[PDB]
Amino acid sequence: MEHVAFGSEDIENTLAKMDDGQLDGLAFGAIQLDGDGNILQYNAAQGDITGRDPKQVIGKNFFKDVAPCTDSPEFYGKFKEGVASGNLNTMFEYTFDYQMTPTKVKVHMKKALSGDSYWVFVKRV
């Protein structure tokens, strides 16, 4: 697989070189969002955690359509503030519970190297 550790300091540089196939080799879930919250990339490990089919969620809005349980000041609110400010680096635990067994995860959101792109990284806890 692709050897990159969750929470690594330079993760956005390392992931800038990966196509969708290489992203599927990561040990943790990875979602790339645009500044409106639309899903641009969604890897295999994320689909294993959540049950979603990675090919079908691309193009959907994460906060409106896919993950309403994240539409809250504690998750979406942090994303919105990061987009508005142009910088974002925050890690926190959360529970995903929409149409699935409630699953506790650690989330790391970080601005990507590309201009209007943001990463959401997820692992089980």
Ligand X SMILES: *C(=O)/C=C/c1ccc(O)cc1
DSSP 43-108: -HHHHHHH---HHHHTTSBIIIII-GGG-STTTHHHHHHHHHHT--EEEEEEEE-SSS--EEEEEE
Q: Per-residue x/- mask for ligand X, residues 98 to 117, rule CB under 6 A?
A: x-------------------
Nearest distance in Å: CB 109, ligand X: 12
The smaller minimum CB distance to ligand X, of residues 18 and 58, is found at 58
> Which stretch, 2-10, 63-71, 78-86, 108-116, contacts ligand X (CB under 6 A)?
63-71
- Binding test (CB under 6 A) with ligand X, winner from 26, 67, 83, 112: 67
Closest CA to 11 of 123, 94, 125, 89: 89
Tell the residue number behind the tokens 């959360």, with chain if given.
Answer: 94
Q: For residue 23, state whether it binds ligand X (rule: CB under 6 A).
A: no
| 68 touches ligand X by CB under 6 A | yes
Q: In the numeric block, which tokens belong to residue 41?
A: 């990339």
Return residues touching ligand X (CB under 6 A).
46, 50, 52, 66-70, 96-98
